Subunit: 115 residues, 4 copies
């Protein structure tokens, strides 16, 4: 009805996607891992790599192997069928007061390591 209040639950719009590179005979360099994150992001979202880079905001190849991107929960589910994907999880701040996510910063292909 016009006065219906439907509860739809949590709205998670920042997601962490980790990847499994342990299989390979030859280990990927950090650059190769980040290039893989970008391709996987584009594939799961159904968008160009250029558009996917705009969604991505952080990644790591050290503390963890994965990337973090803005996407809806409905979007995150599409990653479940891609090869190499391990965790698909809402991202959470490592530093609430500054609203900072963990990992290295990612800006359209530019990584800033965060100590």
């Amino acid at each position: 009805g016009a006065m219906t209040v439907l509860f739809e639950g949590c709205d998670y719009n920042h997601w962490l996607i980790t990847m499994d590179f342990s299989k390979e005979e030859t280990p990927k360099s950090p650059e190769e891992m980040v290039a893989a994150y970008e391709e996987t992001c584009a594939q799961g979202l159904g968008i160009s790599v250029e558009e996917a880079k705009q969604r991505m905001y952080a990644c790591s190849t050290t503390t963890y192997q994965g990337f973090q991107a803005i996407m809806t929960e409905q979007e995150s589910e599409k990653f479940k069928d891609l090869p190499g994907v391990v965790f698909i999880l809402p991202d959470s701040y490592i530093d609430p007061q500054n609203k900072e996510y963990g990992g290295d910063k990612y800006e359209n292909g530019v990584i800033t390591h965060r100590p």
Copy 2:
């Protein structure tokens, strides 16, 4: 992937549906309110009234005007287009210690007042 761990969040299967009888031209007796809950439950789920009576587990005509029933989250969304429906919300315990929902208990049309 074969190792993918997808977070899907909360899945609720106990739902509260409240009703608006303020726009009715004739005031409903308590029994007539319960009859309307049964009809609304049947219409939203696409099942018969006798089948809906099995899903319902509680209701009120005093503290609030609504009923509570077992249904999937997908089924709860079907109530959004029904006339007279106000809140569609996961039900929660009134007494968490005893895992008891609020309102009067409803068992296939037999209702028990609960303090």
Copy 3:
């Protein structure tokens, strides 16, 4: 640790609180019910009635009996021990194209019926 990412769930910042006046012998007028929402909101949030009126954004005495205000999940929990409170729930739009919650609009003490 310095790298620890703890998952805690989502928060909600808009809450609907309904109230039970069915127990009342002498029925409250709509104006009296709204006065009770303002007092309850202030009591639950631990703030002045003046501040509570700034946080409330909608209410009803017809479609339902309740009020809606900006507060966190931690804040909403504090209403559980006040008299007359029935449901405490995250509020949701009734009209997403206008980003409107349900009930009448409440603007710092003034109600516009919707």
Copy 4:
């Protein structure tokens, strides 16, 4: 109030905790990683290592470096202050028809590898 129904979101009692081993100078064997998981689980839960080994049900040192244990959400929060902990997240099935979590199975110290 006596009639108060406070919305309760869903609870999780299966948690996955991942760990970062890089500060340590000597790279660990898989058994040294599992020993660290047992010790971290005990410290986080505030229980003996013997009890912690009973609470764990899976772990990995390959696909990811982490362990999985039964605990409440309030318990999982205590892991946030432990050294080496990276992600603390609700665990989810990798094979939902069989209700199997990921990682290698862990039964009070006995690991069954699950590639």
